């Protein structure tokens, strides 16, 4: 996810549903394990690595909203769910936990029906809280590398032919 | 657990070291608990089935 | 006492072997977490594997009198109370169950007395022209025989406005539409999942000269076949209480939480549905009104909401 | 140590006599009831008379570094979290008080995590053209210098839309208008009285080359004279935290519940009001924007609502 100094507040930089349509095809090691099985549960560990400059400052709010018919349209609407306002100039990576706020004990890994009640837990989105700032002659843009891995309570069962 | 906290633990680490911090970050009004390990993921069990 | 294998209610070592195989069974999942699921009863993380990189209601002994005699009772919830002066049925249809560990870690948001209270759901008329198995519903009710094509979302006006009279009261769909500004509905439209029981009471005041009976049905997962069987003779398998004008002027029925999941999805699932149907057609005295007014009440019991996020109505 | 009588803090027999009289004093009323009033700390009837018919934050030993150095902290409430990587003020302005017995017997309705959470109150711009004592507010704010003729009810659009820029954030008036569909506002419009504390945080990200300071004021009972003195040199008597760009990118301030009554009337009283004013005008580096964006957050602390009745908005 790219982030420039021209990006104004409440600007969306990224959004993905926590459903087998996305979490099983990210390209990450966890997505392959999820695709091998039919059901999954537990917390998901998201790591947003700020690969910008040490002179850069700003804030990116990471929001996790549980399951809904329609995804969040604005920043303040996304901030109504579990969120964390992240100041980029501190330690390099942001440790954002995606909680398993689910209707059932297990979630289905069916790419044909990702928006099902027993499939998706919600949406995770990135918004510009405070604009990227820094001194003159510093880079006008800063890339944020979004990593995703399994939490300590993550599990998968019932094997199948790779979903994708 | 507390409902609000003025001096909460920060949530920024470093993934450059080679390992991901997979521990659930503490949050107010949240109670993170572990889950029992299923036998489906064990390579000794997974590869015992024919393909 | 059977030749067949009913299962040993678990996984045994002698079941699956290289010499012989028996029917495989599933064991109970032992999970930690917050106690929930069952209404009225609900009150450091490390992985367990090493990494490669790391180093009596009905009794002849106690006969209940007719409408004439004094036999008062009451039902209270929140700041609401409903009284009666004659024999009245008031039963929890099923006993409350035991709580279960929840998969989600977030703490629930409770409406409290402002939400868990007895609300005036609807006011409807009961005429003598209605025959056996006639489901009665008013302005806040919905025509639901199971054959109606529900346009999503259920809040669409075409679902509640029909060419014929309404018949059902889908919970919480009818409750949220009747009171959209209530604290229960406020959390309902803000949370992805909910959990609570339901209590429905109906008051029908008739003189000692009036005759007729109404059945208060609580139908789980109402579908075409289920609704039609509730109208029939076998319908009494479902939770029920009869409001007989011979002895009663009101009847109360309460049911605990039910769902395939420990928490029900908001705006997309109706676990319980109320049905006020006629058993014995209204038989009013001559020179008196041919119809009696009925007041339907609804009560959510022990509510909890999980998964807070933006406002998404039903 | 005074010639005058300051009072014995109570009623004594020797004070009022037929031979001499002293200044009368009031004693403490010993009352039973539910514990309330103080936020973050709150957790058979017979008459006693016979009837006639009856038979360190600032210390040189611990200097806090500038914006350059790593000095992280966080503020959490509900499912909301706000992080920082540099020195940041985070103080409860006043210590929480002891609970008191309530005059009303009804049990409170609590919004819980859905209500007590950190909400994005408003997003506003901070330009260098603003001088000393310039109160900053955005779309969700209100122009309140104390001279504006507020048309009742406060929800009237003319109160929030003015010819000049807004200045204040009246609590809960601004919070309820920003999020009218929240569980806190749902109970607010349904209950005649409420009780909770307030936490306000502001995030202003500036580079190591930016200079300027903003003061986060929490003004009790904001009136003409009070608001103008908060702009002046003596304003620091009120709860305050300074957001200095030299060291900070955010500043947090929390205040407990205050009111003449144990419970504040809904839609008719604003105990606290937030004021984000300029101490040192923004001094941005050349060839860079002449204005920085600010994000204002609001957090109700330990909420309780009494007196449930119909829906009456502010």
PDB file of N, CA, C and O in Angstrom, chain A residues 5 18 28 36 40-41 47 57 85 91 94 98 101 116 118 133 156 159:
ATOM      1  N   UNK A   5       2.328  12.356   0.407  1.00  0.00           N
ATOM      2  CA  UNK A   5       2.093  13.552   1.210  1.00  0.00           C
ATOM      3  C   UNK A   5       0.838  14.256   0.694  1.00  0.00           C
ATOM      4  O   UNK A   5       0.213  15.049   1.410  1.00  0.00           O
ATOM      5  N   UNK A  18     -12.430 -10.223   5.155  1.00  0.00           N
ATOM      6  CA  UNK A  18     -11.817 -11.385   5.807  1.00  0.00           C
ATOM      7  C   UNK A  18     -12.674 -12.614   5.400  1.00  0.00           C
ATOM      8  O   UNK A  18     -13.401 -13.221   6.219  1.00  0.00           O
ATOM      9  N   UNK A  28       0.483 -15.115   0.668  1.00  0.00           N
ATOM     10  CA  UNK A  28       1.181 -15.371   1.932  1.00  0.00           C
ATOM     11  C   UNK A  28       1.158 -16.866   2.256  1.00  0.00           C
ATOM     12  O   UNK A  28       0.283 -17.599   1.784  1.00  0.00           O
ATOM     13  N   UNK A  36      -5.898 -25.225   1.757  1.00  0.00           N
ATOM     14  CA  UNK A  36      -5.801 -26.679   1.862  1.00  0.00           C
ATOM     15  C   UNK A  36      -6.950 -27.257   2.688  1.00  0.00           C
ATOM     16  O   UNK A  36      -7.352 -28.406   2.480  1.00  0.00           O
ATOM     17  N   UNK A  40     -11.666 -22.732   9.229  1.00  0.00           N
ATOM     18  CA  UNK A  40     -10.624 -22.021   9.968  1.00  0.00           C
ATOM     19  C   UNK A  40     -11.196 -21.218  11.111  1.00  0.00           C
ATOM     20  O   UNK A  40     -12.369 -20.885  11.113  1.00  0.00           O
ATOM     21  N   UNK A  41     -10.362 -20.927  12.102  1.00  0.00           N
ATOM     22  CA  UNK A  41     -10.778 -20.157  13.289  1.00  0.00           C
ATOM     23  C   UNK A  41      -9.580 -19.485  13.942  1.00  0.00           C
ATOM     24  O   UNK A  41      -8.438 -19.710  13.531  1.00  0.00           O
ATOM     25  N   UNK A  47       0.837  -7.426  10.189  1.00  0.00           N
ATOM     26  CA  UNK A  47       2.037  -6.639  10.468  1.00  0.00           C
ATOM     27  C   UNK A  47       2.286  -5.604   9.362  1.00  0.00           C
ATOM     28  O   UNK A  47       2.700  -5.966   8.252  1.00  0.00           O
ATOM     29  N   UNK A  57       6.637  11.578   9.160  1.00  0.00           N
ATOM     30  CA  UNK A  57       5.693  11.507  10.272  1.00  0.00           C
ATOM     31  C   UNK A  57       4.262  11.454   9.707  1.00  0.00           C
ATOM     32  O   UNK A  57       3.993  11.912   8.581  1.00  0.00           O
ATOM     33  N   UNK A  85      -5.109   3.582  15.736  1.00  0.00           N
ATOM     34  CA  UNK A  85      -4.497   4.715  15.051  1.00  0.00           C
ATOM     35  C   UNK A  85      -2.994   4.520  15.246  1.00  0.00           C
ATOM     36  O   UNK A  85      -2.466   4.583  16.347  1.00  0.00           O
ATOM     37  N   UNK A  91       8.440   2.294  16.259  1.00  0.00           N
ATOM     38  CA  UNK A  91       9.186   1.057  15.951  1.00  0.00           C
ATOM     39  C   UNK A  91       8.740   0.897  14.488  1.00  0.00           C
ATOM     40  O   UNK A  91       7.727   1.495  14.051  1.00  0.00           O
ATOM     41  N   UNK A  94       3.851  -2.297  12.691  1.00  0.00           N
ATOM     42  CA  UNK A  94       2.646  -2.183  13.518  1.00  0.00           C
ATOM     43  C   UNK A  94       2.081  -3.585  13.727  1.00  0.00           C
ATOM     44  O   UNK A  94       1.875  -4.349  12.770  1.00  0.00           O
ATOM     45  N   UNK A  98      -6.220  -9.023  14.352  1.00  0.00           N
ATOM     46  CA  UNK A  98      -7.546  -9.100  13.781  1.00  0.00           C
ATOM     47  C   UNK A  98      -8.330 -10.136  14.649  1.00  0.00           C
ATOM     48  O   UNK A  98      -8.155 -11.354  14.536  1.00  0.00           O
ATOM     49  N   UNK A 101     -14.066 -12.125  15.986  1.00  0.00           N
ATOM     50  CA  UNK A 101     -15.413 -11.772  16.431  1.00  0.00           C
ATOM     51  C   UNK A 101     -16.334 -12.443  15.401  1.00  0.00           C
ATOM     52  O   UNK A 101     -16.779 -11.826  14.429  1.00  0.00           O
ATOM     53  N   UNK A 116     -20.940 -15.423   2.866  1.00  0.00           N
ATOM     54  CA  UNK A 116     -21.879 -16.165   3.708  1.00  0.00           C
ATOM     55  C   UNK A 116     -21.693 -15.826   5.185  1.00  0.00           C
ATOM     56  O   UNK A 116     -20.617 -15.388   5.574  1.00  0.00           O
ATOM     57  N   UNK A 118     -21.461 -17.864   7.614  1.00  0.00           N
ATOM     58  CA  UNK A 118     -20.537 -18.828   8.200  1.00  0.00           C
ATOM     59  C   UNK A 118     -19.238 -18.839   7.416  1.00  0.00           C
ATOM     60  O   UNK A 118     -18.516 -19.840   7.410  1.00  0.00           O
ATOM     61  N   UNK A 133       3.781  13.774   6.560  1.00  0.00           N
ATOM     62  CA  UNK A 133       4.566  15.018   6.586  1.00  0.00           C
ATOM     63  C   UNK A 133       6.045  14.734   6.790  1.00  0.00           C
ATOM     64  O   UNK A 133       6.443  13.691   7.313  1.00  0.00           O
ATOM     65  N   UNK A 156      -7.016 -24.790  11.606  1.00  0.00           N
ATOM     66  CA  UNK A 156      -7.635 -25.199  10.342  1.00  0.00           C
ATOM     67  C   UNK A 156      -7.909 -26.710  10.372  1.00  0.00           C
ATOM     68  O   UNK A 156      -7.103 -27.489  10.894  1.00  0.00           O
ATOM     69  N   UNK A 159      -9.497 -31.288   5.428  1.00  0.00           N
ATOM     70  CA  UNK A 159      -8.740 -31.081   4.193  1.00  0.00           C
ATOM     71  C   UNK A 159      -9.549 -31.168   2.908  1.00  0.00           C
ATOM     72  O   UNK A 159     -10.547 -31.893   2.843  1.00  0.00           O
TER      73      UNK A 159
END
